[PDB]
Design a protein around this nucleic acid. Structure first.
Ligand SMILES: [Zn+2]
Lengths: 204, 71, 116, 52, 115, 165, 85, 134, 141, 69, 206
RNA sequence: UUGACCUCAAAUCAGGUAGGACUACGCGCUGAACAAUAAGCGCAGGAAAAGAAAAUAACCAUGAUUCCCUCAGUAACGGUGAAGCGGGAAAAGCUCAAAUUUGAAAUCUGGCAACAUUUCUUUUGUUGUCCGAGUUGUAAUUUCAA
RNA sequence: AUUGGAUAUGCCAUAUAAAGCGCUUUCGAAGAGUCGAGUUGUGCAGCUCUAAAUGGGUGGUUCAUCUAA
């Protein structure tokens, strides 16, 4: 059929050829972070990205994640709504992995987090759309497989000089939060009105 | 005795039990050569003998390896 | 491992002899072929003009030379290079056309049987 | 220049400490006038010159 | 080009209903618009981020308290975690070395005055 | 020409025809020796395009090498040693099973007059082509050592001191 | 400068499908038969399990475009056979 | 090999539907129905696909192969005892020389010296005192 | 849209049993699942002393009891381990399917025009005839 | 120095000496007869080509040419 | 009895090709043209043998003498041979009758020819041995022969041979060539295999 | 019965060829302790290897390989460490597979026989003839620059 | 003496031949257990799976360039 036990949100994750060791570290850290994401092999075409809708329909995932490495020194992340929907391209800088010595946060894999967005996400329209889209993606829907029922971590999204800061924290009993480890500086580049297509509706 | 005369290199290094010379490696077809033995090579290399044919080739090259008889 | 240049004078004279040995073989003709004029591929160097490898198949055809006799009279051919602008084409056509006007081509000996 | 392998061609190692002889390497083997003679040194006869 | 009308239409089309319970969404928007002007001073922004997270955690806990959802994780929970247990041993060793370095520095400082 | 049909027929290596023949020939090649003479190539299409002409002086030798260095490179080196009076021109893949990979090696006799008088294979009679397989100069030997044009594929540690420095 | 439009080089003509190569490939495709995974894929397409067929072909070949080309090739075999069967 | 496969079906790690699809390969279509013994015997010896092997199946097979009387009271006590007593029977189973007079300028083991030994020449005393001061 | 559902055969699913501590701890919504009582020592000894057919020795996380493959599962394992078609009724030997050659092509495959070689006396023979003519007049033949 | 080299140092057979080491000799001209007659062996090829009215290279020269006057 | 290794290989390959399941494209070569029609085929083919190497040189030197003294002919008619030449003739739709050898050693050289011949509309037949075809063309072997043109005398003869091949090879078999070949077993082989199969299926499943 | 072919053997069968040495430079493989290193193994030449773009670049574009200078201790990677451009040395381009010669296997090795030829009675061919190789494909033609 | 590439000249030449350029109301084949995907080792190799035909490779912001086995 179209779907058995339809979970509200599912994610599809891909990586392009020529990704770096740290970039592959971040991608592996993410797929562990959201358990409702289906990993997929490399995409051979760094240019014909519009096929991702067909991949999304195949795997029944409505949220597309693509980690494109350019020149083996730039990291970009395309996040889109699989059926029609917006497509937002981000640029990644100042990466941080799980294996870093400084970051000692420890969370349960699949535990449903709490999303805390900076109020600046409600100022501009494109920021409103991005906040809502990121909410529907990072927020693990109820009944997701391999997910944990307990609440243990909080993911924080903040806007600083037009740059999104994403920080995950582990709540300790008493908040006394501890940085989990995923720390990277985000940069919105452009937004497409369609799934990897359509006219550009926002430009940096 | 533990060594006898090797027929190939004429040295009393042919092991009786293993039937193998310790100097050249007889009866192996290839001679025993080891680059860590730099002095070992210069003791038995080319030129340490008559070198009768090589001297003939060296002498015959200048005229173009010709044959026949003069006028 | 240290590389030394004590044979730098020895190398310079050996090449001058090699040029002299070429001229002994082929005396009425230059010891170098005629290279075209091209513009280097960068924003730093595109103002300059240096010598390329050979004349494109369109530069030969426009000048009047065919790609078969070009090598015979000493004109190198570059099948890879192409003419993206009329400036490069007209520049190298005149380089060949000057060459053809300054060239003396000695006739060969043609075999011809008794009948046709 | 001197030969790069001049003075290195012998097979000498220090005879050890505590034998009432200078610890300069001495050529091993036996049965010749050379065995027991010190080598591998600027001060030694038939030894490498200092800073070739 | 930054079409607010188009963005608003897309936002309305993909808007999550407000009637959705906080349990289903688990997304909290801070009422206080926390602003960190000192972008260069990351230490100052860290306190602001912690305060925003603490406020969000308190709001979520109060909202989820009426939902009868176990916020606390029992000590008997031994499921698979995001951070590998093998990696935790290396993390503990690194923290132990850093703690020992601070202890040695304090001991040396006390020894300097003692001598 | 039939060589087009053979080329496109050898592309589908698990179809009904190509799977039936693969097993039948694999058992047959196992009955014979590890390195045995092949009277004619089993793939006339592939040998043809690798340099083989059906004239005197061209030799085909079939060899199987255990799976689990490149197997093709091993095939040429073992055959070239076995037939030491010939030159290893090229080689190709013919069959395989769970234990063995079967190859056919095209060799050329450099003392044959049909080879020494052929202007298109004269190049192999010169002594610089002695044991191309041994020096990594064959098609698979070139690949195994990264020889190629592009970015994918002693000047470093030497100190070059000029006269006037 | 005055831009010149250039002709097409013969090396850029490569990839063009010929009438004889199309005929040869279709003749050989029928004669040879189908690979074990192709036989399974055609069963799934006949049983209308299109989603399972595409996932299988992508798993076998290793790329979605290769899978999409193979599924189109095999489904054209199915319809052409069903027209003649 | 079968145990690694049997573990995968039961443990649900590998989906049953995917296992069935993975069973349509180059080797399953090489049918063995009716072939002669002289052909099959070499085919199994040679043309046998080598599937991957997991340590868990190795342990499980060892558990199956563990007979009821594999390790009874005697084979766990006297068999342990014979090894222990064997090991017990296996278990029960420097001189200062001064470089002077005839000992001066030696290169190997000197006369009338056996076992571990050390050589002293009274010149290393200066180095010894310096080392002590270090 | 696509409903963001789950197919019945998706490679990701709940419950990942492992080699036979008991993982009877919790469930969804954070409620403690009752731990099933340990089986009778007599029954456990019987199972340990006599392995059931297809004894995998794998325990699901929910219950401490082992999981054993059923008759059909043993049948599929037998087919898979012996390398045969895992479907009992699926003809691996279908009839010949002439989906392309069942219709006759009315035109020649190539469109290249005929050369004049084929309508005039051959040049290779004429070349050899001239060569043989030269040999005759020179007395060689 | 070598055992091969000391072999002929002590040998009585004279060395295979060939006296071909005449530097500063510029190759004589075959090919064209007219060039050979008007070519003088002291001058370089660049000086001979210029004197005869020919071009040694149709390209630029990668150095400073000579200036005698 | 101890057979040599190559004799054992020969006979095992004969039996192995029988017990296995031969694909329809390879099993159609097991069913060749009948003995009577093959005789009539080769009667026509032996009126169009290519002229011998001696007979060709004999003709050429005859014309060479004429020009050597002082000095227009007809198009030669014969049988067409050579795999690439014949395949090119079939695709050109010029061949009137294609005769495929039944034992070409790498079988895929001719495995597509029955399909290619049926695709292009060419009457074809599979005849016994590569040596009979070779004998016609003065060779040791011909993987395939073909007839494109015959003299007006033999136009009626070829039309009879083509009809006989159509009636005795194409109208016949036909469904028999669409079936997988092989699996043939001896008189006592199934009984022995049935005992082996039931014994194996009992408890020898490991 | 007689004979075609396929495969496989045999011969102190006719004529050939391989091995070992040297190993400075060259090309592969293998490889440590402290370095695409030493040692070990395989294989050549007077040079070897590389080589006529599945190459760069983002320009007004360049145009096989090799080497030199430079780029440059630069970018990148985290101390290591390039390459494109640029200046120069030398320059040279090409051969196949995939096409029906089909109005003609036009191709080739060997034997025998004459005839020449020679660094040479020592070398190298030619012409004739016969047996063979070859249609499961040897020549001419074409190689994308077309 | 022994040779090299030219020049002059004699004899022979199988030209019913061969080629360049230019024109097209006619055609134009292009290398597979290879590329690639997955994984394990040190671009390369093993293992498992295994292709395409304006296709495929490599770059860059649709474009450029190239045409492997
Ligand atoms: Zn010896």
């Amino acid at each position: 059929s179209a779907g058995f036990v339809p979970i509200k949100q599912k994610v599809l994750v891909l990586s392009s050829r020529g990704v770096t060791y740290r970039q592959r570290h971040l991608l592996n850290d993410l797929v562990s972070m959201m358990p409702h994401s289906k990993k997929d092999s490399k995409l051979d075409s760094k240019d014909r990205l519009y096929q991702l809708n067909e991949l999304a329909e195949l795997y029944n995932c409505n949220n597309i994640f693509f980690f494109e490495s350019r020149r083996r020194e730039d990291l970009y992340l395309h996040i889109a709504r699989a059926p029609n929907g917006p497509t937002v391209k981000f640029h990644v800088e100042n990466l941080h992995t799980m294996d870093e010595l400084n970051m000692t946060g420890n969370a349960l894999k699949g535990s449903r987090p709490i999303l805390s967005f900076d109020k600046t996400f409600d100022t501009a329209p494109h920021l409103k759309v991005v906040k809502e889209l990121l909410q529907q993606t990072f927020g693990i829907p109820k009944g997701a497989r391999r997910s944990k029922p307990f609440i243990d971590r909080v993911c924080t999204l903040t806007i600083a000089d037009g740059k999104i800061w994403f920080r995950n924290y582990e709540i300790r009993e008493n908040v006394t939060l501890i940085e989990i480890g995923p720390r990277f500086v985000m940069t919105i580049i452009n937004i497409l009105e369609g799934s990897f297509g359509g006219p550009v509706i926002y430009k940096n | 005795k533990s060594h006898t005369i090797c027929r190939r290199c004429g040295k009393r290094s042919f092991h009786i039990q293993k039937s193998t010379c310790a100097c050249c490696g007889y009866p192996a077809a290839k001679t025993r050569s080891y680059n860590w033995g730099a002095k070992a090579k210069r003791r038995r290399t080319t030129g340490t003998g008559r070198m009768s044919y090589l001297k003939k080739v060296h002498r015959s090259f200048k005229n173009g390896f010709r044959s026949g008889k003069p006028a | 491992y240290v590389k030394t240049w004590f044979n730098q004078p020895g190398r310079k004279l050996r090449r001058r002899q090699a040029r002299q040995t070429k001229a002994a073989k082929i005396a009425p003709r230059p010891v170098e072929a005629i290279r075209p004029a091209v513009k280097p591929p960068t924003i730093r160097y595109n103002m300059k003009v240096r010598a390329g490898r050979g004349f494109t198949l369109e530069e030969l055809k426009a000048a009047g030379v065919s790609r078969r006799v070009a090598s015979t009279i000493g004109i190198p051919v570059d099948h890879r290079r192409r003419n993206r602008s009329e400036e490069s084409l007209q520049r190298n056509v005149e380089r060949i056309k000057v060459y053809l006007a300054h060239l003396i081509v000695f006739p060969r000996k043609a075999g011809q049987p008794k009948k046709g | 220049a001197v030969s790069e392998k001049a003075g290195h061609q012998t097979s000498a190692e220090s005879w050890g400490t505590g034998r009432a002889l200078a610890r300069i390497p001495r050529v091993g083997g036996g049965g010749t006038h050379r065995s027991g003679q010190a080598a591998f040194g600027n001060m030694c006869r038939s030894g490498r010159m200092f800073a070739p | 080009i930054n079409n607010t009308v188009a963005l608003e239409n897309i936002y309305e089309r993909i808007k999550y209903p407000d009637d959705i319970s906080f349990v289903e969404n688990q997304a909290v928007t801070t009422k206080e618009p926390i602003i960190i002007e000192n972008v260069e001073d990351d230490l100052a922004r860290e306190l602001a981020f912690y305060k925003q997270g603490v406020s969000s955690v308190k709001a979520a806990f109060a909202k989820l308290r009426e939902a009868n959802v176990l916020i606390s994780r029992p000590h008997d929970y031994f499921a698979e975690m995001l951070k590998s247990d093998d990696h935790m041993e290396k993390v503990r060793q690194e923290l132990i070395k850093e703690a020992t370095a601070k202890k040695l520095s304090q001991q040396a400082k006390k020894q300097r005055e003692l001598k | 020409g039939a060589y087009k049909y053979l080329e496109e027929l050898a592309k589908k290596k698990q179809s009904d025809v190509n799977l039936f023949l693969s097993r039948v020939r694999a058992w047959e090649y196992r009955q014979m020796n590890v390195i045995h003479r092949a009277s004619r190539p089993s793939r006339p299409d592939k040998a043809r395009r690798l340099g083989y002409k059906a004239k005197q002086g061209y030799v085909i030798y079939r060899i199987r090498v255990r799976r689990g260095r490149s197997a093709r490179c091993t095939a040429e080196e073992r055959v070239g040693r076995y037939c030491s009076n010939l030159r290893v021109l090229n080689s190709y893949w013919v069959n395989q099973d769970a234990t063995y990979k079967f190859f056919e090696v095209i060799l050329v006799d450099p003392s044959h007059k049909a080879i020494r008088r052929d202007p298109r294979i004269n190049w192999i009679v010169n002594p610089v082509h002695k044991h191309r397989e041994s020096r990594g100069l064959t098609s698979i030997g070139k690949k195994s050592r990264g020889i190629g044009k592009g970015h994918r594929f002693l000047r470093h540690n030497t100190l070059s001191l000029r006269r006037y420095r | 400068l005055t831009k010149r439009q250039l002709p097409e080089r013969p090396s850029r003509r490569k990839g063009h499908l010929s009438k004889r190569t199309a005929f040869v490939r279709s003749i050989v495709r029928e004669v040879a038969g189908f690979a074990p995974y192709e036989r399974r894929v055609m069963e799934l397409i006949r049983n209308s399990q299109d989603k399972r067929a595409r996932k299988l072909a992508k798993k076998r070949l290793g790329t979605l475009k290769r899978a999409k080309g193979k599924i189109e090739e095999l489904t054209s075999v199915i319809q052409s056979s069903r027209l003649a069967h | 090999e079968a145990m690694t496969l049997a573990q995968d079906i039961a443990s649900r790690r590998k989906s049953k539907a995917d296992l069935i699809d993975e069973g349509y390969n180059r080797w399953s279509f090489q049918s063995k129905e009716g072939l002669p013994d002289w052909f099959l015997d070499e085919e199994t010896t040679v043309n046998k696909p080598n599937k991957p092997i997991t340590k868990e199946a190795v342990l499980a097979l060892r558990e199956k192969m563990k007979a009821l009387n594999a390790r009874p009271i005697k084979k766990v006590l006297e068999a342990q005892g014979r090894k222990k007593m064997r090991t017990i029977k296996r278990l029960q189973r420097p001189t200062l020389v001064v470089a002077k007079g005839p000992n001066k300028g030696l290169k190997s083991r000197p006369k009338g010296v056996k076992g571990k030994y050390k050589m002293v020449d009274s010149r290393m005393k200066k180095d010894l005192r310096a080392q002590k001061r270090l | 849209e696509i409903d963001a559902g789950y197919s019945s055969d998706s490679s990701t699913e709940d419950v990942a049993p492992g080699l036979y501590n008991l993982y009877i701890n919790y469930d969804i919504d954070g409620k403690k699942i009752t731990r099933p009582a340990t089986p009778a020592a007599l029954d456990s000894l019987i199972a340990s002393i006599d392995k059931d057919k297809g004894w995998t020795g794998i325990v699901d996380p929910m219950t401490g009891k082992p999981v054993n493959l059923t008759t059909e599962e043993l049948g599929l394992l037998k087919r898979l381990a012996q390398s045969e078609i895992p479907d009992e009724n699926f003809d691996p030997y279908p009839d010949y399917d002439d989906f392309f050659t069942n219709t006759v092509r009315e035109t020649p495959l190539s469109s290249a025009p005929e050369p004049k070689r084929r309508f005039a006396p051959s040049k290779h023979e004429q070349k050899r005839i001239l060569q043989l003519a030269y040999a005759i007049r020179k007395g060689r033949i | 120095a070598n055992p091969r080299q000391r072999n002929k140092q002590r040998s009585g057979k004279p060395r295979l000496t060939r006296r071909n080491a005449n530097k500063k000799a510029k190759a004589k001209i075959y090919g064209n007869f007219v060039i050979q007659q008007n070519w003088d062996k002291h001058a370089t090829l660049r000086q001979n080509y210029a004197r005869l009215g020919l071009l040694a290279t149709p390209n630029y020269v990668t150095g400073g040419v000579e200036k005698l006057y | 009895v101890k057979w040599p290794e190559y004799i054992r290989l020969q006979r095992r390959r004969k039996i192995l090709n029988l017990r296995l399941k031969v694909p329809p494209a390879i099993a159609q070569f097991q069913k060749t043209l009948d003995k009577n029609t093959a005789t009539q085929v080769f009667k026509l083919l032996n009126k169009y043998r290519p002229e011998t190497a001696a007979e060709k040189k004999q003709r050429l030197v005859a014309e060479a003498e004429a020009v050597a003294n002082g000095k227009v002919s007809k198009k030669p008619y014969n049988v067409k041979y050579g795999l690439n030449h014949v395949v090119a003739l079939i695709e050109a739709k010029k061949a009137k009758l294609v005769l495929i050898a039944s034992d070409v050693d790498p079988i895929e050289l001719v495995v597509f020819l029955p399909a290619l011949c049926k695709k292009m509309g060419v009457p074809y037949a599979i005849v016994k041995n590569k040596a009979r075809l070779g004998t016609v063309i003065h060779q040791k072997t011909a993987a395939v022969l073909a007839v494109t043109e015959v003299r007006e005398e033999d136009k009626n003869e070829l039309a009879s041979i083509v009809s006989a091949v159509d009636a005795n090879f194409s109208a016949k078999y036909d469904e028999s060539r669409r079936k997988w070949g092989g699996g043939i077993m001896g008189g006592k082989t199934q009984a022995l295999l049935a005992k082996r199969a039931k014994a194996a299926a009992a408890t020898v499943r490991l």
